[PDB]
C-alpha cells in the first residue's frame, strides 16, 4: 500500500488560484473572495488519485466510507462499418475482375468472305486483394481478487462486464484507424485522382470555389455514359449518386455549415451531393474530402474469435479476442481526393493492361492515360527497358518485340515535369512476357 | 460601362490569398486593361497584378 | 466570354442564354437560327440545352 502523497500529483499548475491569486488581487477574482471553504474546494475539487484512510472528524478511531461507486461506461462504434462488405472463411485472395468495352469495326461484305472465324480478345483488367491484418486483443480478468474491491454484487458484475467492453471497443477503435489508413495508403501510393483546390479554411471564396469542384466531380462521376478517368485502373465506369460517399472531417463541415449554408436561401444547390460522413483525420497534408464510390472499400472479415483459457492455480481467465481482416481498396471503383496546397503536375501515368503476354514477332499497342492535375502539357515518352536487340517501342505504344526476344519486358511511359536540370519523372510501367513463336523461325531467307 | 469584381464579398484569412477576377463589361472589344488596388489596411496588405 | 472565368462572366452567359431561348420561341419565328434560313418556330418544351 501507499504512504503519504501530495494532492496535486499530476498537476502542472499554470497559476495557483488558491493563495497566489484569489487572496492577492482586487481584480475579477472578487466573486470568489467571500467564499469561506474555497481553499478546500480549490484543493481536492479536481478529484484525487490516491485515496487515504481519512479518519472521522469526531470519533477519531472511526474511518470514513466510500459512499458511492460510479462505474462509467462507454460504447465505441466504427463510423465506417457501413462500408464493410462481408466475411471469408476459406481462402486469402480476392479476384476482382473488370471487363471493359471494345472497339467498333466497319461493315464490309467482301472482306467478310475471308474473316468469319477471326478472333478478337476482350479487354479485361483484374486486380487483387489479400488478407492484411492478423491481430488479437489480450485481456485478463482475475475475478476472485476483484471481490475485495466491491461491496455490491450489482457493481461487481457491472465492472467485470466493463472489462469485456474494453475489448469490443478497442476492436472498433483499431478497425477505424485501419480504414483511415487505407485512404492514406491510397494517397501516398499516388492513386487517387487529385482535384487541386485551395485550402478552404483561408478565404470564403476558396471555400465556395471548392463546392463548385465538389458538385462538378460528383456530377461527372455519375454521368450515364461513364467516364474513363477518375479511377486508378482507367476503365469506363459509372457511379451512382446514392453510392458516392464524401468523407470530410469536422472542420471542413463547419466551414460549409457556418459560411455556405447559413447564407443559402436554396440549401440543396450548394449541398455536397454525397452521403457525407465525418472523420477527424486523413493525417497527411492538404488531403481532405475524399469522394468515393461505396465499392471502393474491399474490407472483408476472416475471424471473429473469442478464445478463453482459465489458469486454475491463479484464479484468472485470459480473453484473447482475435480479429483477422482483409482491409483493402478497389481501384475499379472511382475515387477523388480534393487535395489543397501544391500538388505535382502529373500524379500518375496509367498504362494499358499490364499483362500483355506477346508472342515473338508480335506487336502490342500500349495506351497511356496521364492523370494530369491542372489543364494540359505532357507528351508521353515511351521505353522498352528490359530485353533488347530488336525490341523497340515507337512514339505510340507499339511494342514489336523480336524473333530472339526471351526475357520479360518493362514497357515504361515516362512523363517529364518540372525543371530541365533536375527532371522529375512520372513513370508508369507495364509488364509483358514473351512466349516463343516456333514458326517462321531459325534462319530466314 | 461597368466593371464587375469576382468574389464581391470576400473574407480572407490573415496571411491568406484570394485570387480576384475583373470582368470588364464593354461594347467594343478592345480588351481593356485593369489596374488593381486596395483601400485601407497595412503596408503588408498589397495586391499584385491579376 | 468563358462562363467559368468569373462570376461576372457567368451571369452574362445566362443573360445571353435566356434572351436567345426566348427568341427561338417567339410566335412569329425567325430566319436567324436555322441553316436553311426558314421562318421556323421552336417551343420551350422542345429546346434542349
From Swiss-Prot, chain C:
**Which ranges does the record mark as transmembrane?**
none
Q: Where does this protein reside within or beyond the cell?
A: Virion
Q: What does this protein do?
A: Assembles to form a prolate capsid shell of about 54 nm in length and 45 nm in width, with a T=3, Q=5 symmetry.
Whom does it interact with, and what assembly results?
Answer: Homohexamer. Homopentamer. The prolate capsid is composed of pentamers and hexamers of the capsid protein.
The Swiss-Prot or TrEMBL record describes its family as follows: Belongs to the phi29likevirus major capsid protein family.
Name the UniProt record assigns to this protein:
Major capsid protein
Which span of the entire protein is present here?
201 to 249 of 448
Amino acid at each position: 500500500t501507499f504512504n503519504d502523497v501530495k494532492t496535486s500529483l499530476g498537476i502542472t499548475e499554470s497559476y495557483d488560484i488558491v493563495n497566489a491569486i484569489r487572496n492577492s488581487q482586487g481584480d475579477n477574482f472578487k466573486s470568489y473572495v467571500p467564499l469561506a471553504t474555497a481553499n478546500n474546494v480549490a484543493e481536492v475539487g479536481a478529484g484525487i488519485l490516491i485515496n487515504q484512510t481519512v479518519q472521522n472528524d469526531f470519533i477519531t478511531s472511526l474511518v470514513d466510507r466510500i459512499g458511492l461507486v460510479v462505474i462509467r461506461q462507454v460504447s465505441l462504434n466504427n463510423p465506417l462499418k457501413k462500408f464493410k462488405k462481408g466475411q471469408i472463411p476459406l481462402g486469402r485472395t480476392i479476384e476482382e475482375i473488370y471487363t471493359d468495352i471494345t472497339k467498333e469495326k466497319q461493315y464490309d461484305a467482301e472482306e467478310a468472305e475471308q474473316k468469319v472465324f477471326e478472333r478478337e480478345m476482350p479487354n479485361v483488367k483484374t486486380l487483387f486483394h489479400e488478407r492484411n491484418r492478423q491481430g488479437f486483443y489480450h485481456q485478463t480478468i482475475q475475478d476472485d481478487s476483484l471481490k475485495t474491491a466491491f461491496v455490491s454484487w450489482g457493481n461487481f458484475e457491472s465492472f467485470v462486464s466493463s472489462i469485456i467492453n474494453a475489448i469490443y471497443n478497442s476492436a472498433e477503435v483499431d478497425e477505424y484507424e485501419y480504414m483511415k489508413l487505407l485512404v492514406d495508403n491510397y494517397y501516398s501510393k499516388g492513386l487517387f485522382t487529385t482535384v487541386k483546390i485551395d485550402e478552404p479554411t483561408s478565404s470564403t471564396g476558396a471555400l465556395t470555389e471548392f463546392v463548385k469542384k465538389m458538385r462538378a466531380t460528383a456530377r461527372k462521376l455519375t454521368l450515364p455514359q461513364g467516364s474513363r478517368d477518375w479511377n486508378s485502373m482507367a476503365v469506363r465506369t459509372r457511379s451512382y449518386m446514392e453510392d458516392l460517399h464524401l468523407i470530410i472531417d469536422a472542420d471542413l463541415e463547419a466551414e460549409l455549415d457556418v459560411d455556405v449554408l447559413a447564407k443559402a436561401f436554396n440549401m440543396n444547390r450548394t449541398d455536397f451531393l454525397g452521403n457525407v460522413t465525418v472523420i477527424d483525420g486523413f493525417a497527411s497534408t492538404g488531403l481532405e474530402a475524399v469522394l468515393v464510390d461505396k465499392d471502393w472499400f474491399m474490407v472483408y472479415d476472416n475471424l471473429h474469435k473469442m478464445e478463453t483459457v482459465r489458469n486454475p492455480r491463479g484464479l484468472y481467465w485470459n480473453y484473447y479476442y482475435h480479429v483477422w481482416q482483409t482491409l483493402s481498396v478497389s481501384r475499379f471503383a472511382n475515387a477523388v481526393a480534393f487535395v489543397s496546397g501544391d500538388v505535382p503536375a502529373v500524379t500518375q501515368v496509367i498504362v494499358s493492361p499490364n499483362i500483355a503476354a506477346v508472342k515473338q514477332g508480335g506487336q502490342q499497342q500500349f495506351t497511356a492515360y496521364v492523370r494530369a492535375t491542372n489543364a494540359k502539357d505532357h507528351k508521353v515518352v515511351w521505353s522498352v527497358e528490359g530485353g533488347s536487340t530488336g525490341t523497340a517501342i515507337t512514339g505510340d505504344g507499339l511494342l514489336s518485340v523480336s524473333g530472339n526476344e526471351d526475357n520479360q519486358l518493362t514497357v515504361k511511359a515516362t512523363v517529364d515535369i518540372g525543371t530541365e536540370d533536375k527532371p522529375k519523372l512520372v513513370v508508369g510501367e507495364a509488364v509483358v512476357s514473351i512466349r516463343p513463336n516456333n514458326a517462321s523461325g531459325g534462319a530466314q531467307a
